[PDB]
Amino acid sequence: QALLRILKETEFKKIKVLGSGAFGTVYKGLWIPEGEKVKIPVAIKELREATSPKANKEILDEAYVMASVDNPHVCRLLGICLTSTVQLIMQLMPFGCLLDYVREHKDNIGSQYLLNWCVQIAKGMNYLEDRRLVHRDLAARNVLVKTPQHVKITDFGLAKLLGAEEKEYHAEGGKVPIKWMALESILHRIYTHQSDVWSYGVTVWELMTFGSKPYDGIPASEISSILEKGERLPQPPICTIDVYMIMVKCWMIDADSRPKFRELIIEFSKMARDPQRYLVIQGDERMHL
Ligand SMILES: */C=C\C(=O)Nc1cc(Nc2nccc(-c3cn(C)c4ccccc34)n2)c(OC)cc1N(C)CCN(C)C
Ligand SMILES: C=CC(=O)Nc1cc(Nc2nccc(-c3cn(C)c4ccccc34)n2)c(OC)cc1N(C)CCN(C)C
Ligand SMILES: C=CC(=O)Nc1cc(Nc2nccc(-c3cn(C)c4ccccc34)n2)c(OC)cc1N(C)CCN(C)C
Ligand SMILES: [Cl-]
Ligand SMILES: [Cl-]
Ligand SMILES: [Cl-]
C-alpha cells in the first residue's frame, strides 16, 4: 500500500469552518511543514466518528483512494492527522467550489470557460473510471476552482470500486441527494460509471444554469416517478440544442446507452473550440473577422 504523510496537530490550526455536514466538518486553515518557513493554506476535513468496528476499519479508506489518484482534474491529499480524530488535509482552493463560483459570477462568465470546465470534469471522471473508481457524488459543489482555467473533482468519501460490497462506514452517514442520482441508483442502489455519467449531466446543467437547484421546490419522493414518466430537467437558457442533447443522453434510463466519459471529452472539446456556436451568452463577444 501507499505511504502517506502524517502531520502533527501542532503543524497547523483551523481558522474557520468552510463547511459542515454528516460527513463531518471541513475547515480553512494554515499549515507550516516542520523545518519550513513557508505557510500553506489548507482545507482540513475532520471525519465523523464510526459507529461500528467495520466502519472503524474503513474510515481511512477515503484517504487511501484520494492518495492513489494522480490527475490534474482530481484533488489530492497532502496528508492525514490522526492525533485524536481523523483529519484529511488538502490544499485550499481560494476560488472555492464551482457551484458558488458560477453563482457569484453569473454575469461575467463566457462560453469558453463553461465548456472548458465540462471538458476538465469529464477528463477527471474518465481518469477515475480507468482506475475502476465510482465517485457517487459528482456535483457542481464537488468541483473546486484552482483557477478559471483549472478545475478539480473532490469529495471521495462515498467513492467505491465497481461492484464492491457497500461499506459499513458509508451507510452510517447521511444519504446522497436523490436529485443528482440515476434512476437505477435510486430504485436499486446500483452504482456504476454510467450512474456517474448521469450525475455529470446534472452537474453540467447546474453550470449552464449558473447554479440553479435541480428540480427546485420538489419533494425527493416525487423524483423517482418523474424520471419514470420520462420528465427531465429543462434546457438551460444559454444552451443550444446540441448541448442539451448531450445532457439528455446522460439521463437515459438504459445506463449503457448513456455516453461514456471519453465521448463527453471529445464532444465538449469540439464545442470548446467554437464556444459561441454552442452557448449563447449576452455580453459574450466574438471578435469580427
Ligand atoms: C461548494 C462550497 C465550497 O466548497 N466553498 C468553498 C471552498 C473553498 N476552498 C476549498 N478548498 C479545498 C477544499 C474545500 C472543501 C470544502 N468542503 C466543504 C469540502 C468538502 C469535501 C472536500 C473538500 C472540501 N474547499 C473556499 O476556499 C476559501 C471557499 C469556499 N467558499 C465559497 C466559502 C463560502 N461558501 C462556503 C459559501
Ligand atoms: C466503532 C464503534 C464501536 O465499536 N463501539 C463499541 C464496540 C463494543 N465491542 C464490540 N465487540 C464486538 C463487536 C462490536 C460491535 C459494535 N457495533 C456497533 C457493532 C455493529 C455490528 C457488529 C458488531 C458491532 N462491539 C462495545 O462493547 C462494550 C461497545 C461499543 N460502543 C457502543 C462504544 C460507544 N461508542 C463509541 C459507540
Ligand atoms: C454478532 C452480532 C452483532 O454484533 N450485532 C450487532 C451489534 C450492535 N451493537 C453492539 N454494541 C456493542 C457491542 C456489540 C457486540 C456484538 N458482539 C458480537 C459482541 C461481542 C462481545 C462484546 C460486544 C459485542 N454490539 C449493532 O449496532 C448497535 C448492530 C449489530 N448488527 C448489525 C447485527 C449483526 N448480526 C446479524 C450478526
Ligand atoms: Cl491535455
Ligand atoms: Cl473540431
Ligand atoms: Cl474542425
Side-chain angles (χ1 to χ4, degrees), residues 1-7 9-12 14-15 17-29 31-33 35-36 38 40-75 77-90 92-165 167-174 176-177 179-188 190-259 261-275 277-281 283-284 287:
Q1 205 134 313
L3 295 174
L4 277 49
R5 174 198 287 273
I6 307 216
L7 317 180
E9 63 185 342
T10 79
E11 252 172 307
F12 64 70
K14 341 206 187 166
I15 294 146
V17 296
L18 288 177
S20 164
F23 69 75
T25 298
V26 48
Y27 305 62
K28 174 186 168 133
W31 174 40
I32 303 100
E36 256 176 79
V38 314
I40 291 159
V42 286
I44 301 153
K45 190 201 212 201
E46 191 176 56
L47 295 174
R48 78 175 174 275
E49 265 184 24
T51 51
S52 86
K54 188 169 177 269
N56 216 8
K57 152 186 172 133
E58 283 158 352
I59 192 179
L60 215 45
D61 291 2
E62 177 174 357
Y64 292 108
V65 356
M66 196 170 191
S68 64
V69 289
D70 180 16
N71 181 271
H73 313 290
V74 181
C75 282
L77 191 73
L78 295 174
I80 61 190
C81 167
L82 289 171
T83 280
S84 61
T85 167
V86 186
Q87 309 206 123
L88 313 201
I89 287 89
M90 310 136 179
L92 198 57
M93 296 298 168
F95 292 113
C97 60
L98 243 191
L99 174 61
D100 296 355
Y101 185 94
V102 299
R103 285 177 180 165
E104 254 292 310
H105 298 109
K106 60 170 174 298
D107 285 321
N108 277 288
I109 294 171
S111 57
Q112 70 190 312
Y113 299 89
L114 285 155
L115 298 162
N116 185 48
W117 293 338
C118 295
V119 176
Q120 297 191 348
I121 299 163
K123 271 169 173 192
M125 296 292 309
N126 177 74
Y127 176 82
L128 299 175
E129 184 178 351
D130 280 333
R131 302 256 320 177
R132 293 187 148 287
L133 288 163
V134 178
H135 187 290
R136 282 171 73 205
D137 204 12
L138 180 62
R141 70 194 162 249
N142 285 332
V143 178
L144 307 175
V145 182
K146 188 164 172 169
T147 74
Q149 300 80 25
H150 195 170
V151 297
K152 278 167 180 272
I153 300 159
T154 201
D155 214 341
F156 287 95
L158 294 168
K160 95 169 161 74
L161 295 174
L162 182 77
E165 268 196 317
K167 292 175 175 159
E168 202 147 320
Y169 185 55
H170 291 165
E172 334 198 309
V176 188
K179 277 167 175 185
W180 282 256
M181 305 184 34
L183 187 55
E184 73 263 9
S185 288
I186 298 196
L187 303 179
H188 308 334
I190 304 173
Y191 295 83
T192 65
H193 299 121
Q194 298 320 97
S195 67
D196 271 347
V197 166
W198 179 299
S199 306
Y200 181 85
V202 181
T203 299
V204 174
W205 185 96
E206 293 178 272
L207 303 174
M208 287 326 169
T209 67
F210 301 95
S212 294
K213 306 207 218 322
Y215 318 85
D216 198 1
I218 287 191
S221 64
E222 324 201 4
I223 295 288
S224 67
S225 64
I226 288 167
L227 295 174
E228 316 210 61
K229 293 201 232 156
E231 319 191 338
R232 298 294 188 267
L233 292 165
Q235 177 195 254
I238 65 174
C239 294
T240 63
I241 200 64
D242 310 271
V243 181
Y244 186 63
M245 258 159 100
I246 289 151
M247 318 183 189
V248 163
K249 308 206 193 98
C250 291
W251 304 329
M252 292 177 72
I253 294 169
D254 183 18
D256 315 292
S257 59
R258 309 173 189 155
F261 283 118
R262 41 170 166 79
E263 293 165 338
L264 298 160
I265 294 171
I266 296 158
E267 270 295 288
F268 275 105
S269 296
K270 184 218 225 301
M271 300 181 178
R273 294 141 194 170
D274 200 351
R277 165 171 182 170
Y278 299 96
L279 293 177
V280 184
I281 286 133
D284 204 20
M287 67 175 31

